[PDB]
Amino acid sequence: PQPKVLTPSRKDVLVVTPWLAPIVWEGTFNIDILNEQFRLQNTTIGLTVFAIKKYVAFLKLFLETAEKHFMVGHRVHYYVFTDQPAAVPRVTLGTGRQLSVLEVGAYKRWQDVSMRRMEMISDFSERRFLSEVDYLVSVDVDMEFRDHVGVEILTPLFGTLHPSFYGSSREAFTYERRPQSQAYIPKDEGDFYYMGAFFGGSVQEVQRLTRACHQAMMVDQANGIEAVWHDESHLNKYLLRHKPTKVLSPEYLWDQQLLGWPAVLRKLRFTAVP
Amino acid sequence: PQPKVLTPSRKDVLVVTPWLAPIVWEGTFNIDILNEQFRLQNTTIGLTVFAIKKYVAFLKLFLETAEKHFMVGHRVHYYVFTDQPAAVPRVTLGTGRQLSVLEVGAYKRWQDVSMRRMEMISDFSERRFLSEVDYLVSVDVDMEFRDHVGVEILTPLFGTLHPSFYGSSREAFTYERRPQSQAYIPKDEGDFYYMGAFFGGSVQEVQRLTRACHQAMMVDQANGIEAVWHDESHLNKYLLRHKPTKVLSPEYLWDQQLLGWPAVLRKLRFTAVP
Numbered sequence: 001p002q003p004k005v006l007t008p009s010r011k012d013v014l015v016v017t018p019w020l021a022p023i024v025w026e027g028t029f030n031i032d033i034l035n036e037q038f039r040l041q042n043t044t045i046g047l048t049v050f051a052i053k054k055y056v057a058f059l060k061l062f063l064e065t066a067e068k069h070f071m072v073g074h075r076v077h078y079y080v081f082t083d084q085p086a087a088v089p090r091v092t093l094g095t096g097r098q099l100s101v102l103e104v105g106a107y108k109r110w111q112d113v114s115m116r117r118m119e120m121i122s123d124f125s126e127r128r129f130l131s132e133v134d135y136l137v138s139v140d141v142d143m144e145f146r147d148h149v150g151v152e153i154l155t156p157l158f159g160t161l162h163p164s165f166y167g168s169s170r171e172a173f174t175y176e177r178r179p180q181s182q183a184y185i186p187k188d189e190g191d192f193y194y195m196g197a198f199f200g201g202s203v204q205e206v207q208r209l210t211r212a213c214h215q216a217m218m219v220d221q222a223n224g225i226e227a228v229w230h231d232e233s234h235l236n237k238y239l240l241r242h243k244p245t246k247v248l249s250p251e252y253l254w255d256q257q258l259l260g261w262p263a264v265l266r267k268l269r270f271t272a273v274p
Numbered sequence: 275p276q277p278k279v280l281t282p283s284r285k286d287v288l289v290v291t292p293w294l295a296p297i298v299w300e301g302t303f304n305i306d307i308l309n310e311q312f313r314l315q316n317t318t319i320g321l322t323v324f325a326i327k328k329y330v331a332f333l334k335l336f337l338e339t340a341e342k343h344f345m346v347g348h349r350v351h352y353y354v355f356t357d358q359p360a361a362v363p364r365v366t367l368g369t370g371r372q373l374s375v376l377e378v379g380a381y382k383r384w385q386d387v388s389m390r391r392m393e394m395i396s397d398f399s400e401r402r403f404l405s406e407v408d409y410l411v412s413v414d415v416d417m418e419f420r421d422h423v424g425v426e427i428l429t430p431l432f433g434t435l436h437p438s439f440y441g442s443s444r445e446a447f448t449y450e451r452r453p454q455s456q457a458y459i460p461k462d463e464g465d466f467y468y469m470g471a472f473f474g475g476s477v478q479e480v481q482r483l484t485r486a487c488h489q490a491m492m493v494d495q496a497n498g499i500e501a502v503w504h505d506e507s508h509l510n511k512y513l514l515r516h517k518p519t520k521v522l523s524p525e526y527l528w529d530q531q532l533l534g535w536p537a538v539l540r541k542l543r544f545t546a547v548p
Contacts, residue, residue, distance in 0.1 A: 003465055005288050005297075005440045006538070014279050016289050018304035019311065020296040020426065020520070023279075030292035033517070037293065152294065166279045191277055243307070246294070264280070 012264060017191065017247060021155075025249045026266040029152045035073060038151040044075040045154070046133035046203075048121060051080060051141045052104060056087040058141045058273060063091040063099075069145035069269070077133055081120055100128075114230045115217045117196075122210035130203050137200035139270070147269040153248055157201035157209065159194035159239045160248040163259055168193065176233040181225050182216035183233040185240060194239050196232030198253045198270070201245070209238055286538060291465065291521060295429075299523045300540040303426045309347060312425040318349040319428070320407035320477075322395060325354060325415045326378060330361040332415045332547060337365040337373075343419035343543070351407055355394055374402075388504045389491045391470075396484035404477050411474035413544070421543040427522055431475035431483065433468035433513045434522040437533055442467065450507040455499050456490035457507040459514060468513050470506030472527045472544070475519070483512055 009015055009028050016022055047070065051059050059080065070076065078099040080088055085101045093099065102124065107113045121138060129136055135154050165173055170190040176183035200206060213234040220227060227233030251265050255272035283289055283302050290296055321344065325333050333354065344350065352373040354362055359375045367373065376398065381387045395412060403410055409428050439447055444464040450457035474480060487508040494501060501507030525539050529546035 002444045003288055003292055005435065005466070006286070007288060008282055008285060009288055009290060009292075011282060011285060012280070014277055014281060014283055016283060016296050016302055018277055018283075018302075019307045020298070020303050022290050022294040022296065024294070028290055028292075029294050033293045037517070161279065170276045192279070243311070 013249070017243070019243050021243065021245050021247055023161075023247045023249055024152055024252070026251060031148070031150060031152065034151045038074060038154060041134070042075070043135065043151065043154070044077060044133045045071050045151075046077045046079055046129050046136045047071075048079045048081065048124075048136060048138045049141045050104070050117060050120075051082045051084075051088075053083060055141050056082060056084050058143070059087075060089040060091065061144050061273065062141050063089065065145035067091065067094060067097070069147060070149050071151065072148075074151060079124070079129075111221050111226060114226065115214060115221070118210045118214040118217060118231050118234070121206065122214045125203060125207045125210060130207070133203060135200060136203050136206040138198070138206070140197040142273050143197070143270055144273055145270050147251075147267045149252065149269045153200070153246065153252070155201060155244075155246040157205040157239075157242065157244045158199065158246040158248060159192075159235065159244045160198040160253045161250050162193045162195035163250040163254050165193035166250050173236075174229055175236055176227040176229070178225065180223060181227050181233070182219050183227040183237040185237055190236075190240060191243070192239075192247065194232075194236055194244075194247075195253050196229070196235050198248065199235060199239075209235075209242070212238055287523070291517070293517050295517065295519050295521055297435075297521045297523055298426055298526070300525060305422070305424060305426065308425045312348060312428060315408070316349070317409065317425065317428070318351060318407045319345050319425075320351045320353055320403050320410045321345075322353045322355065322398075322410060322412045323415045324378070324391060324394075325356045325358075325362075327357060329415050330356060330358050332417070333361075334363040334365065335418050335547065336415050337363065339419035341365065341368060341371070343421060344423050345425065346422075348425060353398070353403075385495050385500060388500065389488060389495070392484045392488040392491060392505050392508070395480065396488045399477060399481045399484060404481070407477060409474060410477050410480040412472070412480070414471040416547050417471070417544055418547055419544050421525075421541045423526065423543045427474070427520065427526070429475060429518075429520040431479040431513075431516065431518045432473065432520040432522060433466075433509065433518045434472040434527045435524050436467045436469035437524040437528050439467035440524050447510075448503055449510055450501040450503070452499065454497060455501050455507070456493050457501040457511040459511055464510075464514060465517070466513075466521065468506075468510055468518075468521075469527050470503070470509050472522065473509060473513075483509075483516070486512055 076097040081102045081104050083104045173193040175185040251269050254268045257274045350371040355376045355378050357378045447467040449459040525543050528542045531548045
């Protein structure tokens with residue numbers, strides 16, 4: 001169908017940020033065009049997920065629903081970081097899709113657990129990921145895919161609108177507010193509140209983001225402070241200073257039990273498990 | 275000011291294409307954010323213009339108005355291609371801005387004149403431009419800047435909505451319709467009608483686009499055909515197959531004598547001289 005210059009793709013939501021990064025909503029993209037563009041580059045997407053202790057129990061639904069909805073037709077490499085390799089379920093995968101289990105060590109105190117995601121993605125992004133995938137996507141495991149999540153999200157760097165804050169003014173954002181923390185954002189600043197549970201971009205940009213947040217968290221620990229929302233607080237500070245080249249709408253990170261299904265979401269793509 | 279997620283930046287126009295490229299309108303961007311992003315990279319923009327025979331007379335207003343409105347605060351290199359080096363006016367330039375005169379030879383029949391822009395940008399993009407600028411922008415000389423044209427346009431590859439067609443259905447687009455031409459677009463295809471008078475992108479992408487259109491035009495000449503709108507017809511075919519990463523609205527290419535000042539243009543930035 002021909003794009004219509006004189007009709008907004010959405011009349012109810014913002015579809016591009018003030019720095020001209022697309023905000024990804026249903027009705028903003030033609031997947032057939034995007035699929036072709038990314039297939040021509042033989043794109044491989046790494047998907048990282050942490051499944052520690054009891055969270056191992058979420059892997060089966062997470063993987064089965066990813067097989068149905070995530071980057072279907074594209075090459076995918078799942079990277080499961082777990083303290084229990086044997087507990088990873090054997091989910092059957094479509095062609096061009098593979099999974100690796102990465103064993104997580106002790107931790108060994110709670111500020112170390114808080115830094116584990118940034119530290120381990122940073123470390124693996126610099127070894128394995130750089131030779132294996134084009135893009136890396138980091139999500140939480142206690143989640144299921146319900147609808148399409150595809151190459152429309154792919155870009156050098158992206159974050160996702162936190163479902164609790166997308167209608168909020170910046171004063172209500174739960175940014176780190178203590179100037180003693182590396183994640184400090186003043187009251188007058190902030191574009192959006194991004195959720196720590198869904199971010200990514202090219203391997204190089206994710207290398208940079210995770211190294212930065214891990215290095216900043218280490219500075220915080222040394223000064224005896226922990227940001228109010230841990231690596232999410234640092235993710236926010238990073239994306240304030242290095243603006244994402246796309247932002248995902250809350251279609252991409254929702255909780256229907258807590259937040260229902262408002263009219264502004266035409267699709268619920270990836271949701272918290274109740 | 276905080277972006278508002280639940281308010282469209284425009285309620286009257288499309289602000290992103292179906293392949294998630296921003297369409298640049300007033301009200302879609304914060305120039306302070308974009309200026310900073312591009313300054314941090316010390317961006318240099320080359321601006322190319324052809325001023326042949328009598329068109330030499332448009333250079334003075336073109337350059338004086340570019341000094342006021344084009345990429346102010348950024349490094350700029352004007353490249354004036356002319357058959358009359360001595361007729362280029364001495365316009366005084368702001369700091370960080372320079373102009374080079376590039377002498378154009380004979381031409382030496384009319385299909386050669388038709389191919390001169392693509393051929394000469396292609397040739398110079400591969401020598402001079404690649405070591406001298408980050409982005410290249412190609413415009414016509416019989417034009418004046420009236421309002422801001424800045425780093426909001428910068429991206430790997432962009433075209434501009436032709437002011438005569440932006441409200442038209444694709445059937446009305448004056449694409450090349452003969453299958454014997456390299457610029458052939460069938461009746462059922464086409465996203466937009468782009469104008470040949472304003473396109474650009476990174477040097478590498480402009481290298482690729484101009485080489486492709488020049489190579490295709492040479493094929494057409496050998497087969498005794500000339501596309502209905504010359505290098506614009508080929509530009510269109512190129513941007514159909516290699517979709518631009520931004521599209522400029524007609525604010526960026528207007529003719530007020532022919533088309534007035536409709537409500538949908540909040541600014542007229544770069545206009546035909548009457």
